[model samples]
Target: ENLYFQSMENFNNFYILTSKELGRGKFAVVRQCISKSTGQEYAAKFLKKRRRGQDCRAEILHEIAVLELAKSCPRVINLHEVYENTSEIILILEYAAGGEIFSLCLPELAEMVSENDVIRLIKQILEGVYYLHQNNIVHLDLKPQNILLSSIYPLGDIKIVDFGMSRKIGHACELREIMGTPEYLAPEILNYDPITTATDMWNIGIIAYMLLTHTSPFVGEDNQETYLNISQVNVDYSEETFSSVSQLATDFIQSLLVKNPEKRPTAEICLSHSWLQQWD
Candidate 1:
């Protein structure tokens, strides 16, 4: 049901030249674009009308609400504007010129950043998540691809983006459906238990693992296999994987990645962890 709006004439204010296809998901295509009115660059997410249903509309509204609520959090990407016609909902978001964190962690740039750099980046992420939890919001999708850097070189600054799968933590809501990338997903999410701020902590654990080792704690040959591995609590780590990372760093990640969501450290607790001492 997803559609692509490649024509510049369709969107009057934001003239898109179709620079490049950033990403494609089951529901939409994200494109890199430039705005004519203010001469600003942005990432435009185009959702097609055919995919618009009551639930889809509700999800979109929820995303908008989350953005509006967290408007003050600089770590969360800003939503510039949104436009809709009979056929689509176009969302214009701040463009991260430096691209996603995954690109920085790639083999080429891995040697360029030190362990302290990684720690600093993760601290910012924790702060942002803490702010969201303080406001009763949970970002269901927290992965490397969702984390962006401010620039390509000397990478440290980070921004969390993509709240399409986010939801507010209801007082009595136990858990919602499983909706997130499998590799970074928590065990509770796999159990179909209601998601909470703890769910975000779990994702942080996975992110910590990747940051230190430049690899995932759980891996499978394919998507189904990855889900199965996650369901079984099959997490593994090695000294070689984190040779340069401090023991406290390793311990922090282990503490957060615990299979039981009840046992995982809260994001606030994580912010105070000894591993983040470098930030002091």
Candidate 2:
């Protein structure tokens, strides 16, 4: 059965009961919807074709390909199907009822999570990443915005979603075009060096820092200044940032965020770090 075809408004002949905007970015707006036929929930990432440009077709196809490759990964979001009409492509993804991990970290949910809870979530994230690396899939974008939480308690169950920038290692013959958020981009990525699975580790390191401190490691008042600070490796850690976080955690992050890509630890090595070992 084509799940993608059933999600379209035109073909399905389903009335638009409600359309609540979930979020919006420069290229698209995401909305949560319910299917009148099955009464099931789904998140539809609506991409404006004209705004996305012809080159974006590659991105769309890439996402589908990666999702197909990661179908067996339990911690990765399930792509039920995809539907493309004239002006937009509707991605029928499994509804993450618990929402994104960022929501759990907000000030409003402070009491709901603690240091131990953060560690649990990071462990699950590492496991998922390990599976991806084992399959030779590199998730270029690994931010809080892309990690969706599962219904399980303590919020450790996470599904890595959004594979728009993902790529399969050793598949494309040429060097990849650099892509990733500035703060999470590894030194090699910034230098336009060949992409590797280690690149995801850099982003995971940034995430670990944020989860522990509830703040960004490096940020400037302006975009240009932020890029400059990142390029210069001007990371600032205050006593307050580490007040509750352990020293081993700090050391783990330091090892992963090193400017020299050759020195960065592998995902397997990182999983064995003393800081992560605390979970065991």
Candidate 3:
């Protein structure tokens, strides 16, 4: 019943949509739009009312609720407003012109990304994670594909996006689910253990490794192989993997990729880490 929206009018009435498509997912399509009154650019994400012949409105609603909860954090992508129709719901969100951080993970561009850039970006990500954890919220699907940048050329602040898999913890509500990207899933996630803030920390470690080395730590030939790699915490820190990387960065990643969830550092602790301390 706490659903918020500008439901009375049509979405097109308030914004001028451009032909440029921002992104396309299995259940949603995002388009670039300009506010009719303020001329500000925003990305309008359209979520289908149904998925596989089933009503899936609750998932979208949960995403909006999570966005609202995270609105105060600058590191989180802002949700401007919402609009709905008989068949779909449209979410108008802050447009991150720089796009996904995956670009920096590419071979050619990875060489161009300096350690300072990785430190700065990871610091911002931890800032957001700290904020979310402070509120007992865990971003279950944290990954490179979901991290966006405000601007590109000169580098920009991180804007964490995609909260559809996020959940609130504590109060004996130990949530457990078998859903997440293979390479980023924590060991507990593979074991179907209760999801905690630690789960996100595991993803952060993988992301840090990817940024610094341009390769995944536990990725395997298939999903089963990947799951096994994650379950056993078989990470490769060989000379080839960290030849050019710093000891501080490897230490930071190792601290997070622990098999025991309880051993992982909290987001607050991670923010104070030596690797990230290089930021200030």
Model 1, runs deviating above 4 Å: 1-10, 52-55, 170-179, 221-228
Sorted by lDDT (best first), the order is 3, 1, 2
Q: Provide the clashing-pair count of each candidate structure.
A: 4, 0, 0
| CA shift of 221, model 3, Å | 1.7
**Candidates ranked by TM-score, best first?**
3, 1, 2
Q: Spell out the clash pairs found in candidate 3.
A: none
State each model's CA lDDT, in order.
Answer: 0.76, 0.73, 0.86
Instruction: Quickly count the clashes in candidate 1.
Output: 4
Better of 2 and 3 by TM-score: 3
- Candidate 2 has an lDDT of 0.73
lDDT of 1 by residue, 33-76 (tens): 88777777788887664553543655676777788788798898
For candidate 2, the TM-score is: 0.84
Q: Write the per-residue lDDT of candidate 2 for residues 1-280, one digit (tens) a residue.
A: 1223334555246424345776787777777777767788777776655552454655676677777787888888888757767666777677777778877656677677877777778888898899989988888788888998876364648889877677777443233344445555655666667778877887888888877777777667876676776667677666876877788888988887776667788888888887766634
- lDDT: worst 10-residue window of model 3: 170-179
Score every model by TM-score. Answer: 0.87, 0.84, 0.93
RMSD to true structure for each model, in Å: 3.9, 3.7, 2.5
How much does candidate 3 score in TM-score? 0.93
Name the candidate that leads on TM-score: 3
What alpha-carbon RMSD in Å does predicted model 1 have with respect to the real structure?
3.9
